[PDB]
Each structure stands twice: as C-alpha cells, then as structure tokens.
C-alpha cells in the first residue's frame, strides 16, 4: 500500500549502526557499476519494527513488489531516462528442514533449504514492460508484469460493436527477464531409512542466474508458491520454489577479496609447505609417505600448451594404484572427493561404459534427440575416481582410450558429431589376481592380457604386506586413538592451530594458486633429465636378456617433466630449480625398480 511505501523510502536512507550509514553507502556503490541489486539481510532488518516484518512474513508477493518500487524511487533520487527496475536478494540462517515439510503450513511462507543442483536448462524470456495496441481504434497502453502468484497474473483486457480480445503484443518497446528451470536434488545423507530421494523445480531472475555449476552443495532461501499446468484424477496442482538468494559456499570466474591471498602469501613465504602437507592432508592415515606425495601433485596439475601449430601437449598426470586389501587403497579415495573443487564418485562396475561418456534419448517435446548425460562432461578441471579394473571385462577399455591422451571425444550417434572439450584427470584403484600369489610367481599376470592400458597411465604404486613386528603395534596403537575416545578431535586442535592446515582451508587454497601462476621449468635443467634417462633404458634392457617380457615407454618420460612442473605450481615460482627437480625424480625412482620386482 502507499502508506506502507511511505514506511520504506523513509527507512532505507537513514538506517545505520554507529556512524557508518551503510545502505546509502552501497546503493550508490551499486549504481556506478551496473548491478541494480540489494542485499537486505533480513535478520539485520528487524531493528525498525517487528510489525513491518510481520506484514511481510505472513503474506507474500505484495510485499516484494512494494519494496521493489520503493527502492527504485530512492535509486532514482540518488542521481540528479534510462532506469531499470531492481531486484531483491534476501538471506537468513534459521535452520533447514531438508525436504520434509510439504503441504502442512509451509505454503507461501519463507523457507531455507540445502541441496545439490544437478541439471541446468537453457535460457528463456518473459516480459516485464509492454505496449499494447487495439485493432479497432489504435488504442495504446502499457502494462507492467512484475511479480507472480509463470504468466496469467493479469490478462489483456477488453476495453478501449467492438469485438473481444482486440489486443496484440508488439515487439518494439519491451524489456525481458530470463528464467532457468534448473532442478534441485536432495543432499543424499539426511533422509535415512531405505528410500530413494526426490526432486523439485525452481526458477530465478537474471541478476542472480548462471552462478552455479552442477556438483556443489548450496543453501537457498525462497518461497513455496504453487503453479498449475494442464500439460490425473482430483483437481491437483504442483509444487515449486521461487528462489531469492543463493548465498551458498564457494564456487568449488576467479574474483574474490585480497585478504584470502594475504595469509596465503604469508604462508608461501615459509618454505615448509611440501613436508607439512603430507601430515596435514590426511589426519587419519598412518604415514604412507610415498603415496601421499603423489596426491597433492595430482590435484594441482601442470599446464596446457597450444604451441604455434595444430597439435598440443596433454599437460596433466594420472596416477594408478593396486595392491592387497586392507591397505587403504579404497578409503583414501573418499578423502580426495571433498577436497577437490569438482569431484565425481562413480567408483563401481564402470556403470555401462557407453553411458560413462554421453547418452542420447528420444525427447518428449518434438520427438527429437539431443545430448544430455555423461560422467565426463561435468568433471572438467577436477578429478574422477573409479575402481575395480579387473571385472569390468566388457567395454571399459574401449571407452577410456579416446577419453584419455587427447581428451577430445566426439559422439557419432544419430544427431550431432561435435568435438566437445575435456580437461579431465582420472584415478583408479584395482586388485591383482588375489594379491599374494601374484607376488610369489612369475611377476606378470597383473592385467591378464593388455599392456596398452598401462602405457596410458604413467605413475604406478605397488604396495605390499610385510611383517614388521615393531611399527605395526604403533598402528594398533593408532586406530584405537581415533576410533573411540575421539582425542584426535582434541589433538588436532592443539597441534593444528599453529602448525597444521584444516581440511576446508585447502579447498579455499588450491583454486587460487592454480588459476594465477603460469609456470615453466628451468631451461638449463634440461641437461639433468636427458642424462638421467639414457641409463634407465639401459637398466631396462639389462632385464630382457633373462627371457623376461611384459612396461616402460617414452610417455612416462614426458610425464616426469609434468611432475617437476607440479611442485612449481605449489611454490608459485615462475622458474624451476635443481633442488626442485631432484626431489621429483626421488619420487619416481621409488617407482622405477617396481618393474624389476
């Protein structure tokens, strides 16, 4: 109402805490750079009046438009015409009833949720300012459609003998807003008896869209209003969420503040990063020092050279594990999932290997095909994780050969044939032929036939089962510490708070130090690896005279040059050194003699 409005233009130009005067001092600061938006922060709003909140929190749609018009008028005042309407962004943190209140009282009430968005759609257009002409008398009006009860808020009237529906929609003086129809999925840990999860639907506005990629946790605040589409028995309807503010966690397109890198620059000046991360990554893993160094260089990566001709160099690494059960080859892999920016966990069976890359289907509108799914289209930049590279006998091998070593797939199916980009990084952990007897026989028979998959991977660990009767009792001392008593929650808060790094700071950290520094190895260091390699092939061919066959080829040699590029991304030095590169071969030379044994 007008009276209500008189009670908001007189409130969002003098609200302040103690001499900062903030809401004029950001609205001006948001009219210079074109954004046209507010962040009210409703829990901070309550200082005026509980009544004016309660005329909002009990009734909808009317309140949003009245508030928007008041803000537009104040914005107009802070100038002296090209002036668009604004949009609001609200945010609070009460608690998130996950997906349980459905119809009881939470219809058109303010609500806060948490989910994982999986499926985006293409953009669209709805109008917000029109100009309408009649057939009979050339009448001219203008009707604005701001907020919604989707369309059919108000229809085109009959007034201007005169025939009905005399009006049309011209396209010469109009404005448009875009919706999304992105689909929210439940975070799959908090509905536990035995059931599958469900899903909802949500739309939004332009100045808060395209802020999400699928594969992230998000929190979300909004309305629970109801539409009705006539494409089921009783006159029913359907639920959806009009959303207001995605004040989620980080993106997990590199814009952020300066103090986030201030401590990072204050940490990177300390030259103790490489030895301290091996403890600070996995706080519940007994040592395993050689493997732990390989995981931090996998997550960072190398570079990508598009050198001045057609071809390119595949600048990344892909580790591979195998070993006996009970030796941490599997439980380590859930640990790399949370720390990655983008991580996918399809670790089982291969899951119908043609469906790993891309899939088509008949689509219900227009009876057509296009491309929808895939386990590799969403995992660019990050890392996938799979297992069991023995009993996928059908088609796992034919589905990763083109997927690796060029990362340029193209689907030859009934519709398109397009080379969509990929920058993926694979990771796997398998089993040999029941472990023990394989390492007590002729040392082949690990992958039963093919060496051609092994030559695409580069870095291979082989763990074993010793009987060291001394350190094992410390391991038996180690597991009873974590498993009950939970003193490592209090030990790794009394050794971490000055020395170690918590689990969530690295997710902040890795996305910054990758996306800034473009490094290059030292040019005079090229004498080192060339002098290194020539005896390794001699160390190879000293074994084949013993009637021994299989695997070392040159692709691992151009992988070590990516390995020495990896820690240069860690130290963020644009040039490499020789104390740098000798520790890198120190990691690989502990996996050169593995081919001998």
């Amino acid at each position: 109402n007008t009276e209500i409005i008189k009670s908001f233009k007189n409130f969002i130009l003098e609200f302040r805490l103690d001499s900062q005067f903030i809401y004029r001092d950001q609205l001006r600061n948001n009219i210079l750079v074109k954004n046209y938006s507010l962040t009210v922060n409703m829990e901070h709003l309550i200082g005026y009046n509980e009544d004016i909140y309660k005329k909002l929190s009990d009734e909808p749609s009317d309140i949003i438009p009245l508030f928007e018009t008041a803000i537009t008028q104040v914005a107009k005042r802070i100038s002296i015409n090209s002036l668009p309407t604004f949009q609001l962004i609200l945010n609070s943190n009460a608690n998130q009833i996950p997906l349980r209140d459905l119809d009881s009282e939470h219809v058109s009430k303010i609500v806060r949720l948490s989910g994982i968005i999986i499926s985006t759609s293409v953009l669209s257009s709805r109008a917000t300012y029109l100009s309408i002409m009649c057939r009979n008398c050339r009448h001219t009006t203008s009707i604005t459609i701001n907020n919604f009860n989707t369309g059919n808020t108000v229809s085109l009237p009959r007034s201007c003998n005169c025939g009905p529906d005399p009006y049309i929609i011209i396209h010469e003086s109009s404005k448009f807003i875009d919706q999304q129809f992105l689909k929210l999925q439940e975070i799959p840990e908090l509905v536990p008896v035995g059931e599958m999860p469900r899903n909802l639907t949500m739309t939004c506005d332009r100045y808060l869209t395209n802020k999400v990629i699928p594969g992230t946790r998000v929190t979300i605040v909004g309305i629970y209003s109801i539409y009705n589409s006539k494409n089921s028995g009783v006159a029913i309807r359907t639920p959806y969420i009009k959303i207001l503010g995605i004040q989620s966690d980080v993106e997990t397109v590199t814009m952020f503040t300066e103090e986030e890198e201030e401590e990072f620059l204050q940490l990177s000046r300390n030259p103790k990063l490489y030895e301290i991360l091996t403890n600070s990554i996995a706080p519940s893993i007994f040592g395993n020092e050689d493997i732990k160094k390989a995981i931090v260089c996998l997550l960072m990566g190398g570079s990508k050279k598009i050198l001045p001709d057609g071809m390119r160099l595949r600048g990344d690494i892909n580790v591979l594990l195998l070993g006996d059960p009970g030796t941490a080859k599997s439980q380590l892999l859930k640990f790399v999932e949370k720390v990655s920016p983008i991580a996918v966990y399809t670790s089982g069976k291969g899951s119908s290997a043609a469906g790993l890359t891309a899939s088509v289907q008949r689509d219900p509108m227009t009876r057509e095909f296009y491309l929808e799914g895939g386990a590799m289209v969403l995992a660019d930049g990050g890392v996938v994780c799979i297992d069991e590279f023995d009993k996928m006998r059908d088609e796992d091998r034919v589905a990763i050969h083109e997927a690796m070593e060029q990362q340029t797939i193209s689907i030859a199916k009934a519709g398109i044939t397009t080379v969509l980009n990929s920058r993926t990084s694979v990771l796997a952990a398998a089993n040999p032929i029941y472990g023990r007897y394989d390492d007590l026989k002729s040392p082949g028979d690990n992958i039963d036939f093919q060496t051609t998959i092994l030559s695409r991977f580069d870095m291979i660990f082989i763990v074993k089962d010793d009987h060291n009767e001394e350190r094992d009792i410390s391991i038996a001392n180690h597991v009873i510490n974590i498993h009950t008593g939970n003193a490592n929650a209090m030990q790794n808060q009394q050794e971490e708070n000055g020395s170690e790094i918590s689990i969530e700071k690295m997710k902040r950290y890795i996305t910054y130090c990758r996306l800034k520094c473009a490094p290059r190895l030292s040019p005079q260091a090229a004498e080192k690896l060339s002098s290194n390699f020539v005896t390794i092939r001699k160390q190879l061919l000293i074994n084949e005279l013993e009637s021994t066959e299989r695997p070392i080829t040159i692709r691992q040699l151009e992988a070590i040059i990516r390995i020495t590029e990896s820690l240069a991304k860690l130290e963020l030095s644009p040039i490499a050194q020789e104390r740098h590169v000798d520790e890198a071969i120190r990691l690989f030379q502990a996996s050169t003699m593995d081919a001998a044994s």
């Binding site: 130009l13 003098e14 302040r16 001499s19 005067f21 004029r24 001092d25 001006r28 802070i78 100038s79 002296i80």
Partner: protein
C-alpha cells in the same frame, strides 16, 4: 625518505592544517599559556565568546572544564537554503564553509554531548552533501578541455582525492598533443 605517499597527502595530516584555525568557546575556569602563539588571559569570565585555536580546546574538553559553541551554520534549519541553490543550478555549487567535512568528524567524536540534537538529524543533513558534491564532480571531469578547469567551492578532502589520478591522466595526454609537432 618516505617513498610511499610523496605526491599527495595522507588523510592523517590534512586535518593537521585545519586544526590550527580558531573558533569560539564558552570558558569556565579562572603564566598558564606561554605557547608563543598563546593569548593567555587572567581569570577567565564565563558566558563570553573568545576566538581560541581548536586543538588546545579539544584537549581542554578531555579534562572537561569548558564547553564548545557550534559555529553559525551548524543547524539543520540553515543548510536547507544550501540544498536549493544547487538543485536549481547544475552549473556549480555556490556557498561552502571550505573545510566542512573534516570539521564535523572532529565535532562528533567526543563533541557529541554538547549541542541540542545533533544526533539522528544532522548526519542525515551531511551525507547528502557528501554525494551531491561528488555527483557534480562526475559530470565535471567528463568535460575536460586542455589545461583549463573551473573548480570554485571544493573541499580540502575532495581535492586530496581527485588529485592523484587527474594529474597524470591529462599529463599523459599532454604528450600526444604537444609532441605531435
């Protein structure tokens, strides 16, 4: 050898040249001031104006044995005539006390419990003037001719803020005009 802020002034010493200008007080107390710029008095009579320099009077309010009087333009019933000569004139701003913005900030920290209703009224009638001035300056510099501008009523604060870019952003174009021939 600072090598940090040399071309300009920091905002910690532009206040230093305005604190050495005098205003009027209401004394209370009864040689005492031989400061070489002093004007010491005898037993001082209350209810009498006297032009005293500001920085000792700020120190005199710490021991709290005096009281300040506001200057003649520091009520909300007086700045209303200022905000109409500008809204009819997009040409320039007319009438300014020339040191106003740095004056009120000293006059609100520890000088809040002196005047009748400064709070919830005067800061509304100040921050509007902090931007209507600077709305005018954004139309101004787009009209940049060669080596000729016209600023009439500019504060010491804004002239310390337009400064460190407007010099070299026209000096760099002074090359291509002059060194063309």
């Amino acid at each position: 050898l600072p090598a940090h802020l040399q071309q300009t002034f920091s905002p910690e010493e532009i206040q230093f040249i305005v604190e050495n200008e005098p205003i009027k007080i209401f004394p209370r107390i009864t040689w005492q001031l031989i400061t070489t710029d002093d004007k010491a008095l005898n037993n001082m009579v209350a209810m009498r104006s006297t032009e005293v320099v500001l920085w000792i009077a700020l120190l005199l309010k710490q021991q709290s044995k005096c009281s300040i009087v506001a200057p003649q333009w520091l009520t909300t019933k007086e700045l209303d005539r200022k905000i109409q000569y500008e809204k009819t004139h997009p040409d320039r701003f007319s009438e300014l006390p020339w040191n106003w913005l740095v004056l009120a900030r000293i006059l609100f920290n520890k000088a809040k419990d002196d005047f009748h209703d400064p709070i919830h009224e005067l800061r509304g009638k100040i921050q509007d003037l902090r931007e209507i001035r600077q709305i005018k300056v954004l139309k101004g510099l787009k009209y940049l001719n060669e080596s000729h501008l016209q600023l009439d009523n500019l504060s010491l604060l804004e002239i310390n803020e337009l400064r460190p870019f407007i010099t070299e952003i026209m000096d760099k174009l002074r090359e291509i005009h002059t060194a063309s021939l």
